[PDB]
Amino acid sequence: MTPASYNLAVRRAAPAVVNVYNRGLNTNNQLEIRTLGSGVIMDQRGYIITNKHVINDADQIIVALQDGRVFEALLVGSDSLTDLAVLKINATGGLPTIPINARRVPHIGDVVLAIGNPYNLGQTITQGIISATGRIGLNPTGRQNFLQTDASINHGNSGGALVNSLGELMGINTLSETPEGIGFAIPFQLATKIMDKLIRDGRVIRGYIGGIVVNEVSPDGPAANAGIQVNDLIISVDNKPAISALETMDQVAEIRPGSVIPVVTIQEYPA
Amino acid sequence: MTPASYNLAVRRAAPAVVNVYNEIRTLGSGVIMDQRGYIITNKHVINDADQIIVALQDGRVFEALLVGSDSLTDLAVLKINATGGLPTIPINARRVPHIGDVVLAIGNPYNLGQTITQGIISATGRIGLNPTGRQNFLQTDASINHGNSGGALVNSLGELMGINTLTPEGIGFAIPFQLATKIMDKLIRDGRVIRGYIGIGGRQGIVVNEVSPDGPAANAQVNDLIISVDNKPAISALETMDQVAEIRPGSVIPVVVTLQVTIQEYPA
Amino acid sequence: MTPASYNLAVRRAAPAVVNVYNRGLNTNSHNQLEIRTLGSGVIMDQRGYIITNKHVINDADQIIVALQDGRVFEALLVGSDSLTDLAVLKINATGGLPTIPINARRVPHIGDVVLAIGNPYNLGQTITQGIISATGRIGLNPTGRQNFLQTDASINHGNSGGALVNSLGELMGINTLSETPEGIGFAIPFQLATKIMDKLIRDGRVIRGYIGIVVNEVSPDGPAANAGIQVNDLIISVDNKPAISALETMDQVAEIRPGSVIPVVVQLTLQVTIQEYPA
């Protein structure tokens, strides 16, 4: 026999996780650490994911690898709604990349490990399960549509990785009587989507509109301008049957402002 | 390869777990025990509830009837009649829980919807009917919060290990399933738990430390050594007290220390 | 089918773990024996040597050890160590003792499932499950809370001095200590705990080599300051061992005995006399 262990997943995923250091200038001279967090190297190009709140208002950003290599990092963009931020590091002499299986479907009960730097103790692995799946939909909803896990999450785990027993990335750790074993991560599929969009446009451009029964209507919104009223029953959006409020709103977000569709001219979501 | 997962147990047991709602006085969780619509939960969840509501992970909601409750075990049985089929919690009565067994707690902590947390059995506790304290419950480092109460604790096979009851970290308790079964049946039948009460406490034989005034024992002294209760050898204080509880009030039994005692109903 | 379980490890290791009770005679006015604090301990071998945390037994007038088999023993303090917070006890045993499983050849790995065995809040023996979050170091030289073993297995007051074992029951470490930090707890690596025990058994205390790689500073009156070494010196050899690591070198110095004299190359070959580490 041999000891039960998840070290496999640790060997594979860990190196691609990094310590992130927000550095600001203190007016009341040099750079002082404002905060810290974790991040995941996504691909060989040097793209990294992390939590927006970690890098917010940073004058300088630094990224350290478990192999000891340190890099100055460039903010590629961020997103409030998902609390995600993409960084990039140059000077590539090769990089560890987080294992990814796009074909992998997360299931409730799946063993997962959270990799991060809680309280700047150095890299820390903690074990738990997927308590709840959440959604990969682009449209914001709330803390309920994230992935939920009883794997232990502290300050410093933010932007860290959540991987299954195979090291495959399940999500990005966002945030955690005293609630015990309740922590959240952004589903990896969604994180991918956000990353690409930030890489591409320097920001996340969301389609905004303002059966499914209309409870209210946004003044001056795209809907109010097209002639839609309260109590209307929406059966089709851009030729797609509207059978779900969640699925419909996720679809609207993928649509680009300026576009015109049969149900209106899409606008960009308000900050 | 495939990811290490307990999702199997989740598929099996989860559906039989429900959100319970006591304006709302409080909320909690419950376990559907069988196809008749009987549900288990914690008494403290439903106490002084004007109405009780039960929601299923399949979206079906039911008005629920309090079948009875128990303070000592903090258990309560509900019932809903359901035309359609109902999910029931997997049960293996032959299964012996062991310390170290992987377990999952299924419940609705902080009303976040159904939540699964993973841990192990830290300690077994006892299935004895006689109350003792928080030590004779099942103990687990699986995460338990407000809203997990009345929820289910199951092993990797989905088999019900116990009902979740209640800065200390990774210390949580559940009523052993074997005991929960017994309590359920008794509440279903009598609308309450009728316990055989004698009115002694003490610590082969059992030495009487004290005697309850007006109790069944006082009516039939300290320092007595009890060697036989109703023809059963008294070799254990725990096993004896559990035995007394199963005996019904009004009954009369031989006690050898040969006296004749009349069992009463336990004081609230 | 059968339920996923670690009970195997529990069966093997648990019996060798014990409840420890610090007792003093000045605790009450009537000068009776009363518990000042309590903890857990691990029976190491058949001789009755037990490991526990120093902070558990500190200033104990009496020490008591209880076994999961009901046997109780008066215990003798063999010695302690502040730096690792370890203490060795001994019990006079007759009729054999449970001993904690040990595999010296076993290499702990991050992610390995572990169980913490102890007596949290004196609830009786309690098992909690987690993994090794970080390895730490087995080096003798003190560093800090970072070079211990780290684990998300649940640790409370009363787990101190308890055992942390893998799925095979093999002792991985001795549990030392644990916004509210969740799933952050520490144990002394077993390899190191062994080293400390033997040294305490033998010398009644841990005798450490102290000296006082680019030199950032120098200790006044220290062995180094007395041999002629200065700041900014580059140390390339310590007692004929290449100094390629600050960690590996300091651990090496600790193994050296006070009074000893060794060559240090910085070329200048000096002669230093090792001293005993300051409390």
DSSP assignments along C173-229, one per residue: EEEEE-----S-EEEEEHHHHHHHHHHHHHHSS---EE---B-----TTSHHHHHT-
Q: Give the span between the Cα atoms of C47 and C125, in whole angstroms.
A: 23
State the first-to-last Cα distance of chain A, in angstroms, to the nearest integer: 57
* Structural domain count, chain B: 3
- Closest-CA residue of A relative to C134 is A124
Q: Do B143 and A181 touch (CB under 8 A)?
A: yes
Last residue of a domain, one of A204, A230, A253: A204
Nearest-by-Cβ selection for C183 from A2, A7, A126: A126
Do both C196 and C88 map to the same domain? yes
**Active-site position among C133, C154, C160, C239:** C160
Three-state DSSP string of A200-254: HHCCCCCEECCCEECCCCCCCCHHHHHCCCCCCEECEECCEECCCHHHHHHHHHH
Last residue of a domain, one of B165, B193, B221: B193
Do both B18 and B61 map to the same domain? yes
Q: Chains with ≥3 Cβ pairs under 8 A against A? A: B, C
In 3D space, the residue among C158, C108, C156 whose CA is nearest the CA of residue C133 turns out to be C108
CATH at A49: 2.40.10.10
Do both B86 and B189 map to the same domain? yes
DSSP state, residue C112: B
Q: Is C159 on the interface with B (CB under 8 A)?
A: no
Do both B153 and B206 map to the same domain? no
Do both C64 and C138 map to the same domain? no
In terms of residues, how long is chain B? Answer: 268
Per the rule left: phi > 0, alpha: psi between -120 and 50, beta: everything else, B164 is: beta
Residue C120: list chain B partners with CB under 8 A. Answer: 168, 171
DSSP state, residue C16: G
Q: Give the span between the Cα atoms of B127 and B104, in whole angstroms.
A: 20
| Residue A173 C-alpha, separation from nearest chain C C-alpha, in angstroms | 15
In 3D space, the residue among A94, A97, A129, A124 whose CA is nearest the CA of residue A111 turns out to be A129
- Quick one: CA dihedral C118, C122, C127, C128, positive or negative? negative
Q: Give the span between the Cα atoms of A205 and A255, in whole angstroms.
A: 9
For C199, how many CA atoms within 13 A lie in the half-sphere containing its CB?
20
Q: What is the resolution of this structure in A?
A: 3.1
Q: Strand, helix or coil at B96?
A: coil
Tell me the backbone φ, ψ of residue C84, rounded to 5 degrees: -95, -5
**Active-site position among C40, C55, C154, C251:** C55
**CA torsion angle for B145, B150, B151, B156 (degrees, to 10)?**
110
Do both B78 and B1 map to the same domain? yes
Token reading at B234: 């008294």
- Quick one: CA dihedral B210, B215, B221, B227, positive or negative? negative
Q: Is B23 on the interface with C (CB under 8 A)?
A: no
Residue B167: list chain C partners with CB under 8 A. Answer: 180
Q: Do A131 and B110 touch (CB under 8 A)?
A: no
Token reading at A267: 């606008």
Do both C94 and C194 map to the same domain? yes
Q: How was it solved?
A: X-ray
Q: Give the span between the Cα atoms of B113 and C210, in whole angstroms.
A: 58
Do both B122 and B214 map to the same domain? no
Residue A155 is among the residues annotated as catalytic for this protein: no
> Cα–Cα distances in Å, from A268 out to A82, A265, C131, C260?
16, 10, 46, 76
- Closest-CA residue of A relative to B111 is A144
Q: Give the span between the Cα atoms of B38 and C76, in whole angstroms.
A: 58
Do both A200 and A87 map to the same domain? yes
Q: Give the span between the Cα atoms of C151 and C187, in whole angstroms.
A: 8
Q: Give the span between the Cα atoms of A28 and A219, in whole angstroms.
A: 45
Tell me the sheet residues that pair with C89. C50, C77
DSSP state, residue A270: P
Q: Is C131 on the interface with A (CB under 8 A)?
A: yes
| Residue C31 C-alpha, separation from nearest chain A C-alpha, in angstroms | 40
Q: Strand, helix or coil at C160?
A: coil
Residue B9: list chain A partners with CB under 8 A. Answer: 109
Question: Which range of residues forms the domain containing residue C246?
Answer: 207-279
Do both C211 and C175 map to the same domain? no
- Candidates B141, B156, B159: best to mutate against C (most CBs of C within 10 A) is B141
- Cβ atoms of residues C63 and C21 within 8 Å: yes
Q: Give the span between the Cα atoms of B164 and B151, in whole angstroms.
A: 5
- Closest-CA residue of B relative to C117 is B122
The greatest distance separating any two alpha carbons of chain A, rounded to the nearest whole angstrom, comes to 71
Q: Do A124 and C184 touch (CB under 8 A)?
A: yes
In 3D space, the residue among A267, A144, A158, A90 whose CA is nearest the CA of residue B111 turns out to be A144
Nearest-by-Cβ selection for C152 from A4, A9, A127: A127
Tell me the backbone φ, ψ of residue C89, rounded to 5 degrees: -110, 175
DSSP state, residue B129: S
Q: Is A263 on the interface with B (CB under 8 A)?
A: no
DSSP state, residue C148: S
Nearest-by-Cβ selection for C152 from A121, A122, A152: A152
Do both B71 and B53 map to the same domain? yes
Q: Do A129 and B2 touch (CB under 8 A)?
A: no
Do both A229 and A112 map to the same domain? no
Last residue of a domain, one of B141, B176, B211: B176
Strand order in the sheet with B65-70: B61-63, B53-56, B17-21, B27-32, B38-41, B75-79, B65-70
Token reading at C279: 């409390």
Q: Strand, helix or coil at C18?
A: strand
Residues whose CB falls within 8 Å of the CB of residue B68, separated by 6 or more in sequence, listed in order: B76, B77, B187, B188, B190, B191, B192, B193
Residue C160 is among the residues annotated as catalytic for this protein: yes
Q: Do C184 and A10 touch (CB under 8 A)?
A: no
Q: Do A132 and B143 touch (CB under 8 A)?
A: no
Residue B34 is among the residues annotated as catalytic for this protein: no
